[PDB]
Amino acid sequence: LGFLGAAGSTMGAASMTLTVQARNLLSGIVQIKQLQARVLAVERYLRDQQLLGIWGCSGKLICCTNVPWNSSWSNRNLSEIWDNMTWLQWDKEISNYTQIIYGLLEESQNQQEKNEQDLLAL
Amino acid sequence: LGFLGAAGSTMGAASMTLTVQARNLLSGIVQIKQLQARVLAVERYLRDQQLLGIWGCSGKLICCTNVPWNSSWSNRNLSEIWDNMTWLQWDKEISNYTQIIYGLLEESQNQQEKNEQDLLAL
Amino acid sequence: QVQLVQSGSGVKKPGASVRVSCWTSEDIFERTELIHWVRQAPGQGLEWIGWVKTVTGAVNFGSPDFRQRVSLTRDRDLFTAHMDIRGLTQGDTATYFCARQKFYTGGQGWYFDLWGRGTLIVVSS
Amino acid sequence: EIVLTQSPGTLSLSPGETASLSCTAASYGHMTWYQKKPGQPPKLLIFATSKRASGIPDRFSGSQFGKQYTLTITRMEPEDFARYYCQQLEFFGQGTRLEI
Amino acid sequence: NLWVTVYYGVPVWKDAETTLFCASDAKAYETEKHNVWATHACVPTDPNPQEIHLENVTEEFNMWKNNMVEQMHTDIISLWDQSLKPCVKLTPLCVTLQCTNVTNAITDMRGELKNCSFNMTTELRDKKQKVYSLFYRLDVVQINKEYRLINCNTSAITQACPKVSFEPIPIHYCAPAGFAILKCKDKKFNGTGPCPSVSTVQCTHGIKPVVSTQLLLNGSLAEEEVMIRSENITNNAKNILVQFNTPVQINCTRPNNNTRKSIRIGPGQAFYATGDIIGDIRQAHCNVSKATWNETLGKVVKQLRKHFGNNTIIRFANSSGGDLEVTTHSFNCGGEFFYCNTSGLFNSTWISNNDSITLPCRIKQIINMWQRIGQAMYAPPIQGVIRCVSNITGLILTRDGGSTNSTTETFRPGGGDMRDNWRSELYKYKVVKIEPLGVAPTRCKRRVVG
Amino acid sequence: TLQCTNVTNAITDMRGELKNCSFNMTTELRDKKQKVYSLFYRLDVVQ
Ligand SMILES: *[C@@H]1O[C@H](CO)[C@@H](O[C@@H]2O[C@H](CO)[C@@H](O[C@@H]3O[C@H](CO)[C@@H](O)[C@H](O[C@H]4O[C@H](CO)[C@@H](O)[C@H](O)[C@@H]4O)[C@@H]3O)[C@H](O)[C@H]2NC(C)=O)[C@H](O)[C@H]1NC(C)=O
Ligand SMILES: *[C@@H]1O[C@H](CO)[C@@H](O[C@@H]2O[C@H](CO)[C@@H](O[C@@H]3O[C@H](CO[C@H]4O[C@H](CO)[C@@H](O)[C@H](O)[C@@H]4O)[C@@H](O)[C@H](O)[C@@H]3O)[C@H](O)[C@H]2NC(C)=O)[C@H](O)[C@H]1NC(C)=O
Ligand SMILES: *[C@@H]1O[C@H](CO)[C@@H](O[C@@H]2O[C@H](CO)[C@@H](O[C@@H]3O[C@H](CO)[C@@H](O)[C@H](O)[C@@H]3O)[C@H](O)[C@H]2NC(C)=O)[C@H](O)[C@H]1NC(C)=O
Ligand SMILES: *[C@@H]1O[C@H](CO)[C@@H](O[C@@H]2O[C@H](CO)[C@@H](O)[C@H](O)[C@H]2NC(C)=O)[C@H](O)[C@H]1NC(C)=O
Ligand SMILES: *[C@@H]1O[C@H](CO)[C@@H](O[C@@H]2O[C@H](CO)[C@@H](O)[C@H](O)[C@H]2NC(C)=O)[C@H](O)[C@H]1NC(C)=O
Ligand SMILES: *[C@@H]1O[C@H](CO)[C@@H](O[C@@H]2O[C@H](CO)[C@@H](O)[C@H](O)[C@H]2NC(C)=O)[C@H](O)[C@H]1NC(C)=O
Ligand SMILES: *[C@@H]1O[C@H](CO)[C@@H](O[C@@H]2O[C@H](CO)[C@@H](O)[C@H](O)[C@H]2NC(C)=O)[C@H](O)[C@H]1NC(C)=O
Ligand SMILES: *[C@@H]1O[C@H](CO)[C@@H](O[C@@H]2O[C@H](CO)[C@@H](O)[C@H](O)[C@H]2NC(C)=O)[C@H](O)[C@H]1NC(C)=O
Ligand SMILES: *[C@@H]1O[C@H](CO)[C@@H](O[C@@H]2O[C@H](CO)[C@@H](O)[C@H](O)[C@H]2NC(C)=O)[C@H](O)[C@H]1NC(C)=O
Ligand SMILES: *[C@@H]1O[C@H](CO)[C@@H](O[C@@H]2O[C@H](CO)[C@@H](O)[C@H](O)[C@H]2NC(C)=O)[C@H](O)[C@H]1NC(C)=O
Ligand SMILES: *[C@@H]1O[C@H](CO)[C@@H](O[C@@H]2O[C@H](CO)[C@@H](O)[C@H](O)[C@H]2NC(C)=O)[C@H](O)[C@H]1NC(C)=O
Ligand SMILES: *[C@@H]1O[C@H](CO)[C@@H](O[C@@H]2O[C@H](CO)[C@@H](O)[C@H](O)[C@H]2NC(C)=O)[C@H](O)[C@H]1NC(C)=O
Ligand SMILES: *[C@@H]1O[C@H](CO)[C@@H](O[C@@H]2O[C@H](CO)[C@@H](O)[C@H](O)[C@H]2NC(C)=O)[C@H](O)[C@H]1NC(C)=O
Ligand SMILES: *[C@@H]1O[C@H](CO)[C@@H](O)[C@H](O)[C@H]1NC(C)=O
Ligand SMILES: *[C@@H]1O[C@H](CO)[C@@H](O)[C@H](O)[C@H]1NC(C)=O
Ligand SMILES: *[C@@H]1O[C@H](CO)[C@@H](O)[C@H](O)[C@H]1NC(C)=O
Ligand SMILES: *[C@@H]1O[C@H](CO)[C@@H](O)[C@H](O)[C@H]1NC(C)=O
Ligand SMILES: *[C@@H]1O[C@H](CO)[C@@H](O)[C@H](O)[C@H]1NC(C)=O
Ligand SMILES: *[C@@H]1O[C@H](CO)[C@@H](O)[C@H](O)[C@H]1NC(C)=O
Ligand SMILES: *[C@@H]1O[C@H](CO)[C@@H](O)[C@H](O)[C@H]1NC(C)=O
Ligand SMILES: *[C@@H]1O[C@H](CO)[C@@H](O)[C@H](O)[C@H]1NC(C)=O
Ligand SMILES: *[C@@H]1O[C@H](CO)[C@@H](O)[C@H](O)[C@H]1NC(C)=O
Numbered sequence: 001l002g003f004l005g006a007a008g009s010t011m012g013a014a015s016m017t018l019t020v021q022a023r024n025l026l027s028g029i030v031q032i033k034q035l036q037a038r039v040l041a042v043e044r045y046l047r048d049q050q051l052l053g054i055w056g057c058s059g060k061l062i063c064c065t066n067v068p069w070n071s072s073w074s075n076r077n078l079s080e081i082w083d084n085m086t087w088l089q090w091d092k093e094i095s096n097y098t099q100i101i102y103g104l105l106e107e108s109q110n111q112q113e114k115n116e117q118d119l120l121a122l
Numbered sequence: 123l124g125f126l127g128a129a130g131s132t133m134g135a136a137s138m139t140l141t142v143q144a145r146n147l148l149s150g151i152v153q154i155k156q157l158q159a160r161v162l163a164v165e166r167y168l169r170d171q172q173l174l175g176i177w178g179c180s181g182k183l184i185c186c187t188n189v190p191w192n193s194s195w196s197n198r199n200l201s202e203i204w205d206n207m208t209w210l211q212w213d214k215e216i217s218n219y220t221q222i223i224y225g226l227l228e229e230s231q232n233q234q235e236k237n238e239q240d241l242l243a244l
Numbered sequence: 245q246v247q248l249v250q251s252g253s254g255v256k257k258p259g260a261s262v263r264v265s266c267w268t269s270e271d272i273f274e275r276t277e278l279i280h281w282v283r284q285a286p287g288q289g290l291e292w293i294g295w296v297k298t299v300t301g302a303v304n305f306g307s308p309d310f311r312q313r314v315s316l317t318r319d320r321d322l323f324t325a326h327m328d329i330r331g332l333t334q335g336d337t338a339t340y341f342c343a344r345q346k347f348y349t350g351g352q353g354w355y356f357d358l359w360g361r362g363t364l365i366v367v368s369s
Numbered sequence: 370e371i372v373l374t375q376s377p378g379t380l381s382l383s384p385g386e387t388a389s390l391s392c393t394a395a396s397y398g399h400m401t402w403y404q405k406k407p408g409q410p411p412k413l414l415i416f417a418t419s420k421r422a423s424g425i426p427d428r429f430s431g432s433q434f435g436k437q438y439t440l441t442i443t444r445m446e447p448e449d450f451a452r453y454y455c456q457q458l459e460f461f462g463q464g465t466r467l468e469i
Numbered sequence: 470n471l472w473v474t475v476y477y478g479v480p481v482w483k484d485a486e487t488t489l490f491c492a493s494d495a496k497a498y499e500t501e502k503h504n505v506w507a508t509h510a511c512v513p514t515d516p517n518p519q520e521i522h523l524e525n526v527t528e529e530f531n532m533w534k535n536n537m538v539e540q541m542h543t544d545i546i547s548l549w550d551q552s553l554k555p556c557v558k559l560t561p562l563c564v565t566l567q568c569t570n571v572t573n574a575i576t577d578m579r580g581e582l583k584n585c586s587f588n589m590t591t592e593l594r595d596k597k598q599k600v601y602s603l604f605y606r607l608d609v610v611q612i613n614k615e616y617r618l619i620n621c622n623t624s625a626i627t628q629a630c631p632k633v634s635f636e637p638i639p640i641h642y643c644a645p646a647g648f649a650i651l652k653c654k655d656k657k658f659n660g661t662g663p664c665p666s667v668s669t670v671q672c673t674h675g676i677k678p679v680v681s682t683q684l685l686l687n688g689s690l691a692e693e694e695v696m697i698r699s700e701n702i703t704n705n706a707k708n709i710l711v712q713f714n715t716p717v718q719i720n721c722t723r724p725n726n727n728t729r730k731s732i733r734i735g736p737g738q739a740f741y742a743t744g745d746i747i748g749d750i751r752q753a754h755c756n757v758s759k760a761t762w763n764e765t766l767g768k769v770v771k772q773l774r775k776h777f778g779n780n781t782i783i784r785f786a787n788s789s790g791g792d793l794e795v796t797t798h799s800f801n802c803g804g805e806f807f808y809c810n811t812s813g814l815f816n817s818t819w820i821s822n823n824d825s826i827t828l829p830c831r832i833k834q835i836i837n838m839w840q841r842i843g844q845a846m847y848a849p850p851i852q853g854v855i856r857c858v859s860n861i862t863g864l865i866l867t868r869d870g871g872s873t874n875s876t877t878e879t880f881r882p883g884g885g886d887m888r889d890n891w892r893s894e895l896y897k898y899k900v901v902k903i904e905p906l907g908v909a910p911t912r913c914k915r916r917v918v919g
Numbered sequence: 920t921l922q923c924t925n926v927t928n929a930i931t932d933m934r935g936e937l938k939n940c941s942f943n944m945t946t947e948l949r950d951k952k953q954k955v956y957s958l959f960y961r962l963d964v965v966q
Contacts, residue, residue, distance in 0.1 A: 015237070016233070018233075019232070019233055022172065022176065023176070027168075027169075027172045029165060029169045029172060032154065035154075038161055038165070039161060042165065058180075059175055059178070059180045059181065061233075061236055062240055064243060125521055125669060126480045126482070126521055126649070126669050126903075127480075127521050127524075128480045129480045129481075129523055129526050130523055130524040130526055133909065136479070136480060139480070140477065140478035140479070141478065142478075143478035143480055143903075143905070144478045147644075147646035147647060148646075148647060148903065149646070150646045152646060153512075155488050156488075156491075159487065159488050159490065159645040160645075160646075162487075163646040163647050166647055170905060173906070174475070174477065177475060179475050182477070183476065183477050183478055184477075186472060186473075186474050186475075186911070186913040186914070186915035187473050187474070187475075187915050188914060188915050189473045190470060190471065190472055190473070191471035191472055191473050191910040193471070196910075200471060200910055203909060204909070209480055209481050209907060210481055210482075210526075212907070212909065213479075213904075216908070219908075220906075223473060223908055226473075227473065227475075231915070235917065238919070242919050245412065245424060247410075277706075278706065289454065289461055289462065289463045289464050290411070290461045292459050292460070292461065292870075295706075296791075297791070299840050299886070300791050300794065300795040300840065300884075300885040300886070301790070301795060302788075302789065302790075302795050302867075302884075302885065303789045303790050303791060304705055304706075304789065304869065304870055304883075305789070305869070305870070305871065306459065306870050307871045307872070308871070311789070315790065316790075321842065341410060350533065350700035350706075350707055351399070351704075352399060352417060352418060353399035353400065353401055353417025353418070353456075353458065354401070354417070354456065354458050354459075354704075355413065355416070355417065356411075359410035359411065359412070360410065361410055372872070396703070398703060458703060458704060458705075459705070459871065459872075460872070561949065563948060563949070564950055565950040565951070588950070617948065621948075622947055
């Protein structure tokens with residue numbers, strides 16, 4: 001696959017390249033409008049890392065939650081999604097309620113898990 | 123031993139000061155060429171964190187892998203390296219091994235462990 | 245092999261003064277750290293005379309026999325250099341050359357990358 | 370003691386064999402070589418570092434040890450028959466000449 | 470068996486160049502808000518003592534490749550140029566001057582001063598005025614009564630701004646985060662080659678942007694004995710930094726209550742020019758202690774013999790020629806620019822086995838800095854009193870070339886390249902970058918629980 | 920103000936393309952003026 005080779009391929013196959021994509025400037029790392037561009041690349045990276053930190057997904061390429069998948073928002077078989085679709089197509093199907101999904105990751109998983117862990121700790 | 127005071131110590135002894143080195147502007151933190159210098163320090167810092175994230179070593183000063191050491195890279199004893207050498211000498215000693223080692227850590231450990239762990243989670 | 249433009253040749257009486265000069269384009273001159281002069285007498289090997297620094301005009305001569313009788317000058321706005329010789333003798337008959345060095349790093353030795361065609365000075369009765 | 374001297378001096382050469390010229394000097398340092406023909410200004414052959422001078426068509430090479438430097442010229446080509454001189458900073462040698 | 474392990478924060482560095490931060494004394498800025506070197510904002514001096522002695526660490530230095538010099542040089546020029554942009558733009562000043570020598574003077578017939586007048590513009594396009602005032606011989610050329618300014622065919626002559634001090638202010642250079650400045654602690658260091666002992670510092674200290682030609686003034690003093698340093702010793706193109714271990718003190722003065730006149734040459738366009746002079750007029754000059762100077766040269770000679778042998782003769786001589794800036798000692802005292810005759814200092818020969826030296830000086834108001842082509846600065850006069858004291862810390866010397874029939878060598882003042890001054894302070898420091906990534910063997914297997 | 924006529928005594932190729940014009944230009948001194956002469960192309964000038 002290689003960089004950019006991966007996006008077109010079945011969503012399952014794409015998982016093999018997640019580090020490749022991270023290395024090839026996805027991370028925003030840089031090898032007076034040019035200065036502004038360098039700063040913006042950094043901001044984009046840190047913002048996304050903050051989301052992962054909120055979700056408890058930081059440090060991982062693949063991260064799971066206890067929030068159920070909204071099947072009514074995709075209407076497809078599990079294997080159909082992983083083998084018969086690209087990520088480019090997939091993004092269009094679940095784009096509308098994405099604000100909800102992100103909120104659920106915080107509320108349904110992390111706020112409660114941290115409180116329960118604190119109760120066990122004390 | 124203070125900033126870089128560890129350079130005069132053995133590689134083993136030096137490990138006690140890794141946090142100190144992290145504190146002493148390794149972080150890139152500040153107390154129009156001066157602006158560019160500040161941006162550069164940040165870019166360098168984030169790059170190194172990404173590399174640790176790729177290795178799965180993020181958040182730790184010391185990290186292990188299942189990738190075996192090549193005795194042919196140094197032809198030195200384990201205790202010889204830790205007690206009879208400085209880090210400055212060591213870097214020179216294995217300096218042409220960075221490309222292979224860095225690739226092995228990603229390919230042999232980090233992507234593989236994450237895929238296997240996902241399968242257990244399914 | 246870029247040539248420096250050299251002044252013409254001629255004959256002088258003993259004790260007379262003479263001026264020798266050379267010119268270059270501004271993109272040649274600016275690059276030069278030192279302008280050197282050498283002398284080629286018939287039947288002899290090449291002899292170093294001295295040099296002038298293009299920036300400050302500082303001069304460092306070889307034998308004192310030249311220092312007393314030779315003055316070197318430069319003009320950065322005209323992209324030229326001049327050698328003024330006084331007290332000419334019959335022993336000074338020789339071909340004189342303008343030559344240049346553009347090496348700015350020490351330990352590399354001296355270089356004469358550019359040369360003029362040179363000029364002949366004859367001193368006689 | 371003469372600071373810079375050259376050898377062998379004038380010699381006959383046969384094209385097809387590679388030439389060898391050499392010179393020595395007081396103390397130690399980088400040394401360079403020039404080619405000269407009658408009626409012409411001299412030209413640089415070898416950089417003082419022994420690196421070939423720019424504009425030279427890969428026929429010249431050399432190296433040094435101690436106080437001595439050796440210059441070689443590929444196949445003694447007749448086109449290169451000329452006066453040759455060593456230089457060490459302020460000093461020039463007496464030179465050599467290639468003949469046949 | 471052994472396995473690969475990763476260590477973040479490892480104390481390893483590599484040679485590198487990076488832009489350094491300008492730091493200075495905020496209090497110096499408070500004493501003069503428009504000082505060109507102080508700047509309007511900077512990093513604090515960071516006077517805090519070095520934490521680190523780097524025991525058992527050695528490394529190679531090469532002051533001739535030290536890029537801190539280029540950054541210092543670039544910043545000094547850039548600050549100078551920026552400080553002159555607000556200035557009045559005296560370009561209209563170049564008009565035909567008609568004049569003769571100063572008459573009815575008390576005097577010291579010195580030809581140094583002329584009394585000149587010209588048709589100058591005024592606040593109104595319709596009106597002209599006669600300015601008068603005095604000029605120095607060095608600033609003018611003949612077209613014989615008709616004169617022109619010596620730099621009138623350059624792109625511009627502009628007045629130094631009247632409220633900008635040029636007094637040197639200490640400038641410290643500090644590392645960017647992730648970088649460090651290393652300092653060689655070896656006593657009497659060459660400035661090149663392996664250093665037996667090093668240390669780490671957050672910033673440089675004590676460096677001042679002092680402009681001078683033949684004699685470095687107010688620099689660091691060699692630690693024990695006079696040091697001789699050069700890029701090479703066989704290449705006569707290279708300059709020698711003498712580095713005295715003791716100062717040689719000099720008094721310099723300038724006569725005599727010269728008054729100043731303020732002329733508008735256009736709307737609000739103030740032009741300053743030299744007015745009348747009260748009392749006797751004397752040639753400017755300096756005293757160098759004769760005894761101190763002689764002892765100092767003897768120490769230099771002893772060091773030179775280390776490179777040339779003990780069967781040698783060391784001769785000194787004055788400049789061979791070239792621009793006024795290289796042939797004379799030039800310096801800025803009180804805002805005035807002086808050029809002094811140093812030949813009295815070098816008339817000596819040294820052979821193996823309350824008095825003072827007075828040096829005459831000359832003054833010009835038009836200065837071409839750093840041998841720049843096409844630009845010139847006109848200094849406004851300082852109002853009548855210059856008193857200046859300085860520390861000579863070393864000389865910039867060159868050696869005559871040519872073959873000899875003897876062991877005699879001759880040395881002269883030379884250089885004039887300001888980068889050689891900066892190097893005399895920066896040789897102690899080196900810039901490196903810290904590289905945290907490292908790997909080493911251990912027995913660990915990275916046990917995994919899934 | 921330029922005062923001038925067509926180029927004359929030229930070898931030529933009456934083409935009106937070139938003009939020979941003179942004027943009083945300033946000098947390095949406010950007090951002096953010089954006659955420049957030189958050539959202009961027709962496209963660059965108007966009456
Ligand atoms: C080597 O170091 C010495 C000492 O550090 C240095 O000599 C010093 O020079 C400064 C500046 O010329 C002198 O400071 C002056 O002191 C007088 C004392 O009354 C002041 O009046 C001066 O003020 C002037 O500038 C002000 C700026 O706004 C004006 O407002 C004011 O009206 C004056 O014009 C100024 O502070 C200092 O006294 C001397 N020190 C000695 C011992 O003379 C020397 O110049 C350095 N050498 C080199 C080559 O830099
Ligand atoms: C000024 O610049 C000069 C150069 O233009 C400097 O001269 C150099 O000085 C060093 C130190 O004295 C000399 O090194 C010596 O080399 C000889 C022999 O060379 C050996 O290594 C070469 C590598 O290619 C090899 O080919 C030879 O066979 C030898 O193995 C040694 O025997 C000496 O011990 C010493 O190492 C340099 O040779 C010399 N010039 C050159 C071109 O090497 C001079 O020192 C500078 N002056 C200063 C810095 O003050
Ligand atoms: C800017 O103006 C100055 C001053 O007029 C110009 O410098 C002058 O340049 C001329 C021509 O090179 C020099 O003339 C020489 O005079 C000597 C006298 O013995 C004569 O032997 C030479 O043959 C020649 O005639 C003149 O001396 C020199 N003036 C000074 C004070 O050095 C300068 O060239 C002008 N810059 C320009 C036009 O770009
Ligand atoms: C791009 O298209 C080609 C050609 O269709 C894909 O090649 C597939 O290779 C695998 C190998 O096991 C076969 O099983 C597939 O049947 C081939 N194509 C299809 C459509 O199945 C190639 O994988 C495609 N690249 C992607 C999807 O990223
Ligand atoms: C620098 O080197 C010295 C030795 O020259 C080190 O001193 C060591 O001190 C420990 C103290 O227990 C001894 O056990 C070692 O044997 C000493 N070393 C030697 C070689 O005798 C000093 O620690 C070194 N600096 C650093 C930072 O480690
Ligand atoms: C320069 O020349 C001017 C003009 O001659 C001198 O000033 C004149 O001095 C006389 C005598 O006091 C006055 O009567 C004139 O009115 C003055 N002229 C002006 C314009 O004020 C000036 O003193 C001379 N400068 C010197 C000699 O240094
Ligand atoms: C200013 O004084 C100088 C002398 O110091 C005058 O020039 C001299 O004029 C006399 C003749 O009257 C000559 O004999 C001298 O040789 C000249 N000296 C020099 C150095 O050339 C000068 O003319 C006076 N004023 C002006 C405007 O020239
Ligand atoms: C240069 O002048 C200064 C004074 O401006 C001299 O320094 C003073 O010398 C007297 C001598 O009795 C001392 O009492 C003062 O205390 C000195 N002032 C100081 C040290 O600030 C200086 O010695 C003179 N230099 C020379 C070479 O004569
Ligand atoms: C340099 O030394 C000279 C000579 O000692 C000083 O000039 C003397 O200054 C005093 C001041 O009262 C006069 O009385 C003497 O007649 C002067 N001697 C002369 C003119 O030969 C000179 O001032 C000193 N320069 C300084 C200290 O800058
Ligand atoms: C240099 O100029 C200053 C003035 O700018 C002179 O100061 C005068 O000193 C006398 C001394 O009694 C006072 O009465 C005057 O009032 C002062 N002038 C002013 C304007 O206040 C100083 O004396 C002058 N020096 C010389 C050599 O004349
Ligand atoms: C260096 O010192 C000498 C005196 O020892 C200065 O004297 C010059 O000597 C030559 C001899 O032919 C004269 O022609 C010159 O006229 C003398 N001086 C001048 C200014 O021309 C020599 O000038 C000094 N060099 C300098 C000051 O650069
Ligand atoms: C620099 O100082 C020296 C020494 O004072 C000056 O040499 C003088 O040159 C004139 C030339 O006619 C001689 O008459 C003097 O006797 C010399 N004085 C000596 C030898 O002590 C030299 O001229 C000065 N240079 C300049 C440019 O002024
Ligand atoms: C020339 O060097 C001397 C010696 O370093 C300087 O005098 C010293 O100044 C410092 C200032 O803090 C004092 O602490 C020392 O005690 C002084 N040493 C003495 C008096 O022997 C002198 O100031 C320097 N001159 C200049 C112009 O910088
Ligand atoms: C998955 O495939 C089965 C096939 O019988 C189908 O019944 C089911 O609805 C599919 N799930 C989807 C489309 O989400
Ligand atoms: C998303 O919203 C847009 C705009 O309302 C609508 O046109 C589209 O059908 C929606 N798509 C999905 C997948 O809900
Ligand atoms: C060790 O080096 C050998 C060299 O042939 C290589 O084949 C082997 O794979 C290397 N081991 C590791 C862990 O890289
Ligand atoms: C470690 O030391 C032992 C001592 O007998 C030696 O045999 C072995 O080869 C050494 N290992 C190295 C140098 O890697
Ligand atoms: C890296 O390669 C260079 C090439 O000559 C070699 O000299 C050096 O020893 C090598 N370093 C390592 C760590 O293998
Ligand atoms: C200055 O202008 C006046 C006229 O206002 C003129 O007469 C004079 O000649 C000009 N300059 C001189 C030196 O006369
Ligand atoms: C300077 O370098 C020379 C040559 O290596 C050496 O002999 C001398 O001792 C050095 N000086 C110092 C102070 O190290
Ligand atoms: C300098 O010292 C020497 C002796 O070493 C002496 O002969 C000479 O006269 C002294 N120069 C002076 C005092 O100016
Ligand atoms: C310069 O000005 C004068 C003013 O009378 C005018 O006659 C002249 O034509 C102008 N220029 C030329 C070249 O004549």
